[PDB]
């Protein structure tokens, strides 16, 4: 099949506006010495650590 | 399960050796015949000395299916060859002898003569 007619501006924009992305949320690193933003349930790219203020196990050597 | 074009062997001594199911009696659109079901058959092969000729349309009752048969008590019965027994149009065998084992489902108040002539009812 082929598009019979050129789609109107209103309809094209109605469909196109739904092509979007949500913002990444980010969470503050539990390490007091780092305090950076990292993905939830993900090792902090700055400190390379994971876990609550206590645990704090190293995950990434960075 | 016996359907149209299924070829069966004969447990009678009528001289017929092989039947071809032309129809399964019991209602329209019915697919299969099981132990104790009546079918319309044609005689594909018969003994030269006998009272049944090849190409004759007869009625038979199915005994000794290969597929399986469930029973209300949860057991199953299974044979190794699809067999059938010809009838005289009134529920009685055409032959005077029955060959091989016969299913118990024939003794559901219906085929008393066949069960009586059965060498073994399993």
């Amino acid at each position: 099949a082929v598009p019979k007619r050129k789609m109107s501006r209103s309809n094209t924009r109605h469909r196109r506006s739904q092509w979007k992305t949500v913002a990444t949320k980010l969470v503050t690193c539990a390490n007091p010495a780092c305090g950076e933003k990292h993905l939830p349930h993900t090792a902090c790219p700055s400190c390379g650590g994971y876990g609550p203020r206590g645990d704090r196990r190293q995950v990434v050597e960075a | 399960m016996i359907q149209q074009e299924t070829r069966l062997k004969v447990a009678d001594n009528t001289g017929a050796k092989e039947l071809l199911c032309i129809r399964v009696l019991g209602g329209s659109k019915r697919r299969y015949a099981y132990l104790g079901d009546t079918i319309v058959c044609t005689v594909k092969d018969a003994i030269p000395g006998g009272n049944v000729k090849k190409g004759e349309v007869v009625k038979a009752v199915v005994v000794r299916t290969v597929k399986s048969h469930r029973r209300p008590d949860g057991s199953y019965i299974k044979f190794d060859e699809n067999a059938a027994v010809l009838l005289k149009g009134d529920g009685e065998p055409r032959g005077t002898r029955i060959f091989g084992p016969i299913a118990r489902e024939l003794r559901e108040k219906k085929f008393m003569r066949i069960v009586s002539l059965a060498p073994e009812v399993i």
């Binding site: 993905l39 993900t42 090792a43 994971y50 995950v59 990434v60 | -």
Partner: protein
């Protein structure tokens, strides 16, 4: 252990078997490995099965582990270091932690690592 339900890694179940076995071998070789989320979570059960089998050291057990792995050096590592490291552990010999994503294809990445500290 349990099969993978969905489509297999590497475009073929045979290749998935190879991938999981090699990935477990590399995990045992290096202690830790960064191997994306799905591969790590799929290799965890096999790796823990192997470690549990290696927790008790017999010749028959070593041959059974060598059925997998197939690098006797890694078998020696598993039966000498990793095995005795988990004398008191009742399972859970490995852990998986997410790292981020790959820039090239947005693969969610994670590191799976054998437990290092002694339970006692």
């Amino acid at each position: 252990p349990k099969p993978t339900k969905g489509p297999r890694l590497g475009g073929s179940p045979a290749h998935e078997r190879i991938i999981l076995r090699n990935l477990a071998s590399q995990l045992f070789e290096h202690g830790r490995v960064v191997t994306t989320v799905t591969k790590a979570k799929r290799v965890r059960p096999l790796a823990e099965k192997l470690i549990n089998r290696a927790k008790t050291d017999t010749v028959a057990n070593r041959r059974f582990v060598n059925r997998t792995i197939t690098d006797r050096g890694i078998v020696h590592i598993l039966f000498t270091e990793i095995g005795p490291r988990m004398e008191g552990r009742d399972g859970g010999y490995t852990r998986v932690t997410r790292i981020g994503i790959r820039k090239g294809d947005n693969a969610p990445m994670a590191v799976i690592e054998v437990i290092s500290d002694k339970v006692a």
